[PDB]
Design a protein around this ligand. Structure first.
Ligand code: ICS
Ligand code: CLF
Ligand code: SF4
Ligand code: FES
Ligand code: FES
Lengths: 289, 121, 477, 145, 121, 289, 289
């Protein structure tokens, strides 16, 4: 009854903090969870462990004798709430696929038996800038049963969500990979939540929640701690708890309907994110025409 | 034909007996024997099933046709140098890098190496 | 003795060696620190033996033919080469079996090619084929043939794999060529590795495509138990009173069919890690069968191992395990009550091959006996990692000990009992120090399980408290 | 032949610049590929202009030009026209022309000695983009401690 | 045993049938079959016959003894990483780089690659 | 705080004497230094140990069976000022690669623990007459953190310096190996001092010091003593102390952008080392044309 | 009846010019000859071709499709006197054996059939700094029937000659490789010719000739021509002709007797190259003792 979930999101919108807070909320709710940080950067699994730059699976493999002699205790470390978090890491930027670490980490964890123990949730934190190679490996294989997309108000986040939905619909007929819903991180945009709701409607899915931005998150991350561990009584704490409650009770798994670029532009123009461009102003400059 | 599948993902190289010239194109062999080469398309225009094939017999290398589809995909990936393209075009000899979804098994001993990654990188 | 006295003793012993031998032997001796987990920081192992120092190690042929392949009863084991290797290892190991010897069982028989000088010069690949034909002619009920290579076979360049393949194709019989030349390894351990490789490559995979065997969720296999004095039997019953069905034993009282049926089980219980981890890992990798190490020496270790094995299964197996423990509790309690007062406080020094120097420690602890020193002949550093958590603090550890080193260590420490092989028994029996053969159980046993613990205690009491050790000193001297 | 990295005051931009620099040195042996110099885009950060020059010298390169943010560029984007074709007399056009001239006569082609992650952390801590934290309450509840 | 000799010097890889466990140590096989591995010593202390051996069967790799002479020569050349030395010492498994004059052929399929250069470089 | 340095250069230009004088000048400052020679001839430590033909590691290992039996006391000898000296040696010509000696010596020293005690500097004296993988072990591996090339006005010295620079950039990705700066030995060439500085800037480095030729160094060599231990009041000693001080506070560690063959030709043509020839009688007899 | 000769010599003593002049003298004497320049630098085969930097076999192989698609006409070019000269070249200095080009060139030439044509002399120009790898490949194999060593007055040239003689005696029992004699290039040392004669006597061989130094050689090389082609009437021209006459008439092929380092020092001390060092002056400095 293990639930394999993958949080896909482009870098730069605080995906790691949302994932770690959701995992902490699930841990405090009497659930045993595991984190695999598929981000090439080691930003994930830092707030839970309270230790910066947990050693990656790639670094430990290159340390001595590749994967074969690597012990399971060296890669995953217990953190807050009794969770087990392991960092995958990435190769040298110049050489190889940037998602090779994801493939190596998943294959190592499957062979070692880190999943066969009694776990309920396994969360893969994956970048959404490019859905290809090792980044699309969880989707291409049946490693991630549910996919949750962390989106934002800017164009790039919505485009990344559309690309991830395209990858979901590509392998829909092979495995049981489904898009559970969209998670929104607040960029303080006035119409951000409504724009995400509209995008989820166009993708044929639900917006599972909307995470507001507040300085308590910044204080928690500057102290290398989760908001829930920093202040269980804060409003953001119960917000994350409600998000976890909705995630664990979620039953809407659907093959999405990716939208075209023009339809994506329609949402931005409609919700005021992007201004409407008149056809007459194009091609002619000021102070001449 | 004896095919030895090697990869960093695989804990050990796998020796496979295969029937030469089958419509299954060394992907079918890999999928039958559990070897996991990344195949992510059905027409043949991606580079995912890129592999490196070494003819271990040397004096038993068979002539083959390098289809324009496979040649164009290899050139798009960047694993077809001018010399190997000329050799394939003139002398009918296979290049070192092949696409595992379009490579027909011949009656020889081959070593197929993949990185578990798409063709481009 | 403290860590300071032991190191001084170690240096005094090593003072007599030549400087190169002294430097080499300094690495193999250490004083136990239980807080150390990585033994490589203290002891080096699996190294060659220093020439001329009278080591106690063996050959790869002893490790393969003598230890692993030998106990298989339904097969015929040819000793390809001269007569001596096969003659010296015949029936010297007490791997018990049940069968009609010479008809369907061949454990205590010596089959050899008996190389002459005309076979060293002109090869022996035709003699092997003729021998296989004669074996098939005279022993029709054999279920396989294993050709164990002796030293000359590799040196003269004989191709026995080709002969094995050709004659197996001809006679439709399983012929296994084992390249267990004596010079190939520093000790018997490489013999174990070679024998396990031969088993994996020629016997194990015969029934990969056969599904006629009726598997059960309680099927297990006993791996690395060679039935010394009946040991495996005493274990097997203990595993069938808990409801488990032991499908195969490897290799004491084993048959070529149980080996082939082994991949059809749900768990591999490995007693000797050193000799059978090579095939246990292969089976786990290929067939997915998990494996675990169990210890049936003494009541405590037996109870712990039974509880772990039950924990590997469902609740009914655990209830049966508790029933078995409750049933056997008074029997070993009576043995302890009778024998512990006599064997309380005694100090023991052990030196055995690769498993028992750490397995039997629990049995001596249950009788109130302290192991003041243990060591192996051909153990690796996976064995010393396991050993360092078994021995007490400031206890001596040795690897591939020589005659001089062992004699000097025994003279200084003065243990109450010594456990080692036949080649040291009389050396320490002339020194007035009781000795127990921990290889063949001194022609006694079994020692595994709850039934073997009584025999263990009785033998230790009869040897340590024998009235013959008070008479060595002549009354007029 | 020549690489020009566009970076900003944000930490991710540098991080990407450092990754590109590490990629450059990997293949520097095979061919003549050198880093021409970092370019900047003003995100209206106070220390943004002086942050990038602190990186160019540490990478052995030069900040070729600091580009300031103006509304004229954005108002030219909605016309689908470059700012130098839209308002040639604008000071933004003068900058861009200076940038182009510098690009032309740029003979500084060096191998970009890459910085490490902690070295990048230290400079961002120094310039106030992120604040230095030390021995704060970590692994403890805020009200408890 | 089937041994496939590969090298940039060789125009084609050569397939050789060999008898396992002979006193000739895969040099003898190379010299019998004309493969030119640089052997420039008679005791075993140079690195010239350095080769890279790949076990093509993977599940048929045999246990072997890494003699202290060969281990010291490999460490002097620099083709014996700590992990492979530990693996050879503990699990009796051969390293990737071997010395072709001290390597006893085992009953498996092997791919032997050399550069026609001494071991050091 | 140990600074493992190496001094490459063409043989025959007095590289060994300059290196030994530099190390003696370091030792005069109280720095604990160690010289690890790498030439096949053990001439690298004959002016500090006051000895002749110091025993090499290769010879001792051959006579003592193997390297596993050798003792650190035999290999490592102390000299003037406490600078421990080790000569790697080399194999016989016809047998194997000639660069096994340095690799064996480095392994022996790192296993015995000679590096870890208190050393501030560990200078490797490598012969750069031919740049091959045998002697490039300090560069191929991460042993030689800093490189100092000894060059002269002669064209072969530069050529060797350019080859070493090309070798450095090859392995710069793997480890932190940088060119500290070129050193010079005065062959009494008029333009020699200004020629090397024309190379350091073109290589992105700095000429750390121009060493002038003096008869006092040669008269100290026949005493088997360094010039700074022979005549401390000599100006040669002052210049060598300046060189040592510059070596100490040298923070310029750059990747040596290599020049091409024609670029090296042009500078030598400019400085008068060789004269420029153009459209002369080529392929024709002198008296005929 | 093809005569395979190899001229072994350390770089920096003008080996290439002597080899090219000897080859030209043999060409003018009615002999068809071939040159293989095994020097990693392309300095050889430059005076004969009158063209700088002839393309190497390694460069052409790396240009397109390695050795297999390489045409024999691309690598060897006809030069003065109808000779056929081909440059071998070398790899990148950082990677691989520096003598790999020698092995590749020799194997390519054997397979193509550049030897089976009617030739009388094939001269391999090889460096003597290190006798190992591809540099010792002609000696290790039977590719060079006769070996001629270019020596000079300094210690390094004599040491290189001794090392080459050690390589000759190493493979003496296997092939027919023999040391024909020693060639001396004038370093303007007063006792250079006598020192070379003494060294040849100690090696059990003959000094085949002594080549004086004169400015006509410099004028010929600055015009990219051989002295013989530049001025057949010059004294150096007939000197080279006499050297060629002695080489083609040479019948003294002997396994040499390498000398120890101390015996080599004896020759330098005896002939005044190196001063005699008294034992009392060692260890004590001036102005103190
Ligand atoms: S197989 Fe081994 S020497 Fe594990 S070779 Fe030896 S019948 Fe010993 S300590 Mo004889 S690794 Fe068995 C052994 Fe132990 S023959 Fe017996 S007693 S438990
Ligand atoms: S290591 Fe055999 S006892 Fe020996 S002299 Fe030969 S007949 Fe006699 Fe092992 S395989 Fe055997 S037991 Fe030795 S010979 Fe080798
Ligand atoms: S790499 Fe250098 S030292 Fe080694 S064999 Fe080649 S030329 Fe000789
Ligand atoms: S899988 Fe798309 S090319 Fe083979
Ligand atoms: S040839 Fe010297 S090591 Fe094998």
């Amino acid at each position: 009854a293990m639930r394999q979930c993958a949080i896909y999101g482009k870098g730069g919108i605080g995906k790691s903090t949302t994932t770690q807070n959701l995992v902490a909320a699930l841990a405090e709710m009497g659930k045993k969870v595991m984190i695999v940080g598929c981000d090439p950067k080691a930003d994930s699994t830092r707030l839970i462990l309270h230790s910066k730059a947990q050693n990656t699976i790639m670094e430990m493999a290159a340390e001595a004798g590749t994967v074969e002699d690597l012990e399971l205790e060296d890669v995953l470390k217990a953190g807050y709430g009794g969770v087990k978090c392991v960092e995958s890491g990435g190769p040298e930027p110049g050489v190889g696929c940037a998602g090779r670490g994801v493939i190596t980490a998943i294959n190592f964890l499957e062979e070692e038996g880190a999943y066969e123990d009694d776990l309920d949730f396994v969360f893969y934190d994956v970048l959404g800038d490019v859905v290809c190679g090792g980044f699309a490996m969880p989707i291409r294989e049946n490693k991630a049963q549910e996919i949750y997309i962390v989106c934002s108000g800017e164009m790039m986040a919505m485009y990344a969500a559309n690309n991830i939905s395209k990858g979901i619909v590509k392998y829909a007929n092979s495995g049981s990979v489904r898009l559970g819903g969209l998670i929104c991180n607040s960029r303080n945009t006035d119409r951000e939540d409504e724009l995400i709701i509209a995008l989820a409607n166009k993708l044929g899915t639900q917006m599972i929640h909307f995470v507001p931005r507040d300085n308590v998150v910044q204080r928690a991350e500057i102290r290398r701690m989760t908001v829930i561990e920093y202040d269980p009584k804060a409003k953001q704490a119960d917000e994350y708890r409600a998000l976890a409650r909705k995630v664990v009770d979620n039953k809407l798994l659907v093959i999405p309907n990716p939208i075209t670029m023009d339809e994506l532009e329609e949402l931005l123009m409609e919700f005021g994110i992007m201004e409407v461009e008149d056809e007459s102003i194009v091609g002619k400059t000021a102070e001449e025409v | 034909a004896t095919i030895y599948f090697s990869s960093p993902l695989m804990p050990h190289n796998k020796k496979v007996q295969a029937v030469a010239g089958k419509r299954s194109t060394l992907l079918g062999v890999a999928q039958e024997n559990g070897v996991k080469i990344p195949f992510e398309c059905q027409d043949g225009n991606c580079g995912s099933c890129l592999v490196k094939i070494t003819h271990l017999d040397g004096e038993r290398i068979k002539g083959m046709l390098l289809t324009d589809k496979e040649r164009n995909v290899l050139k798009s990936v960047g694993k077809l140098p001018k010399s190997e393209e000329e050799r394939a075009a003139v002398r009918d000899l296979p290049p070192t890098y092949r696409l595992a979804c379009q490579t027909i098994v011949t009656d020889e001993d081959l070593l197929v190496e993949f990185t578990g990654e798409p063709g481009g990188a | 003795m403290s860590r300071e006295e032991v190191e001084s003793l170690i240096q005094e012993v090593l003072e007599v060696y030549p400087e190169k031998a002294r430097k080499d032997r300094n690495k193999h001796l250490a004083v136990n620190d239980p807080a150390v987990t990585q033994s490589k920081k203290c002891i080096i192992s699996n190294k060659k033996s220093q020439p001329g120092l009278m080591t106690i190690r063996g050959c790869a042929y002893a490790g393969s033919k003598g230890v692993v392949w030998g106990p298989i009863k339904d097969m015929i084991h040819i000793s390809h080469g001269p007569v001596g290797c096969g003659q010296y290892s015949r029936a010297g190991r007490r791997n018990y079996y049940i069968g009609t010897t010479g008809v369907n069982a061949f454990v205590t028989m010596n089959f050899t090619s008996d190389f002459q000088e005309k076979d060293i010069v002109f090869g022996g690949d035709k003699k092997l084929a003729k021998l296989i034909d004669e074996v098939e002619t005279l022993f029709p009920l054999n279920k396989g043939i294993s050709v164990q290579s002796e030293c000359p076979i590799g040196l003269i360049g004989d191709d026995i794999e080709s002969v094995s393949k050709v004659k197996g194709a001809e006679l439709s019989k399983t012929i296994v060529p084992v390249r267990c030349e004596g010079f190939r390894g520093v000790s018997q351990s490489l013999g174990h590795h070679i024998a396990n490789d031969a088993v994996r490559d020629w016997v194990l995979g015969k029934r990969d495509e056969d599904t006629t065997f009726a598997s059960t969720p309680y099927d297990v296999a006993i791996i690395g138990d060679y039935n010394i004095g009946g040991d495996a039997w005493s274990s097997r019953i203990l595993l069938e009173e808990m409801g488990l069905r032991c499908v195969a034993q490897w290799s004491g009282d084993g048959s070529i069919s149980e080996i082939e049926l082994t991949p059809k089980v749900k768990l591999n219980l490995v007693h000797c890690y050193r000799s059978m981890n090579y095939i246990s890992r292969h089976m786990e990798e290929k067939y997915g069968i998990p494996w675990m190490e169990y210890n049936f020496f003494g009541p405590t270790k037996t109870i712990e191992s039974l509880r772990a094995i039950a924990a590997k299964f469902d609740e009914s197996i655990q209830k049966k395990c508790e029933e078995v423990i409750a049933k056997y509790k008074p029997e070993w309690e009576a043995v302890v009550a009778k024998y512990r007062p006599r064997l309380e406080g005694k100090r023991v020094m052990l030196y055995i091959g690769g498993l028992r120097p750490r397995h039997v420690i629990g049995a001596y602890e249950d009788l109130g006996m302290e192991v003041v020193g243990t060591g192996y002949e051909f153990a690796h550093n996976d064995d010393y990692d396991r050993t360092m958590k078994e021995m007490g603090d400031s206890t001596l550890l040795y690897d591939d000990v020589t005659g001089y080193e062992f004699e000097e260590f025994v003279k200084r420490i003065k243990p109450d009992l010594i456990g080692s092989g036949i080649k040291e028994k009389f050396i320490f029996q002339k020194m007035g120090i009781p000795f127990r053969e921990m290889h063949s159980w001194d022609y006694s046993g079994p020692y595994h399980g709850f039934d073997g613990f009584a025999i263990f205690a009785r033998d230790m009491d009869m040897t340590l408290n024998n009235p013959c050790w008070k008479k060595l000193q002549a009354p007029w001297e």
